[PDB]
Amino acid sequence: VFEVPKQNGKYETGQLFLHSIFGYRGVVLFPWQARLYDRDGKTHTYYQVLIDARDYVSHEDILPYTSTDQVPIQHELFERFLLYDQTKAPPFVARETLRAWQEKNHPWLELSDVHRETTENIRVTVIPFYMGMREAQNSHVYWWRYCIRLENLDSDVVQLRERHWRIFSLSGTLETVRGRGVVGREPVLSKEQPAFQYSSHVSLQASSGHMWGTFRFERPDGSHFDVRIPPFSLESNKDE
């Protein structure tokens, strides 16, 4: 049974839902507040989500539904994070392991800002996450994992062909990567399947710096245009 989307209120831990785009069966583990930067101070609520039969989602992407059976798979993770069927709006309540995992994630999610920008009817959404070491062997180097979502609001078909990353670090050294496709594939965005979301890692020295980029898109009429990636930062340990 599909519920209605909440217009003023977060989703309780344990709500079953489908993703607004590429609808997969997921369950929210806990929400976290993020800062939006729509280039086109404002906060926004995102959710840690455990997916099945196939991540961080937004509030507007959650399409909730209720069920009876233990629908979500990955039972080796739900038996550890959640408790069995009970009596509450979400019938899965959170176990103490999920509360400890939430307390462990809360500091690292503070270094995560969501950035958006719409260029020629192409909306890109980038959000970095931190996984690193204060000291890598021989020399201190830590990395990040940035999630990027491409969306085509226009009805015109278009395909991503080239990427043009430009990574600047704290030391003053800046890297520039012009590559073919994204994750070794060139996604197409049309009326059917208009969105594509991926994630990749970026290693860096000095444990600071910002990253901007450019995605090259091609239309069936031969025209190629560059969409901008909103410059997102890569910070560590309580600093903005």
State the residues that interact with Pt ion by CB under 5 A. Answer: 131, 145, 147, 199
> Measured from the CB atom, is 18 or 147 closer to Pt ion?
147
> E strands of the chain, at which residues?
16-19, 25-38, 43-51, 56-58, 62-64, 82-85, 92-94, 113-118, 122-131, 141-152, 158-169, 174-180, 188-189, 195-205, 209-218, 224-233
Nearest approach in angstroms of CB 34 to Pt ion is 13
Q: For Pt ion, which is the closer residue by CB, 97 or 199?
A: 199
Distance of alpha carbon 195 from alpha carbon 6, whole angstroms: 23
Rounded CA gap, 103 and 89, in Å?
Answer: 23
Closest distance to Pt ion from the beta carbon of 212 (Å): 19
Tokens linked to 164: 């043009």
Q: How far is the CB of 57 from Pt ion (least distance, A)?
A: 9
Tell me how far, at minimum, the Cβ of 239 lies from Pt ion, in Å. 20
Q: Please, which residue, 105 or 199, has the CB nearer to Pt ion? A: 199
Q: Which is nearer to Pt ion, 21 or 147 (CB)?
A: 147
Q: Which residue is nearest to Pt ion (CB)?
A: 147
Comparison of 92 and 128: residue with beta carbon closer to Pt ion: 128
Amino acid type, 73: I
Let me know: does 66 contact 83? Beta carbons within 8 Å. Answer: no
The nearer residue to Pt ion, 84 or 108, going by C-beta atoms, is: 108
Which residues does the chain break after (C to N > 2.5 Å)?
40, 54, 90
Q: Nearest 10 degrees: CA dihedral of 51, 53, 54, 59?
A: -30
Minimal distance in Å, beta carbon 146 to Pt ion? 8
- Tell the smallest beta-carbon distance from residue 83 to Pt ion (Å): 27
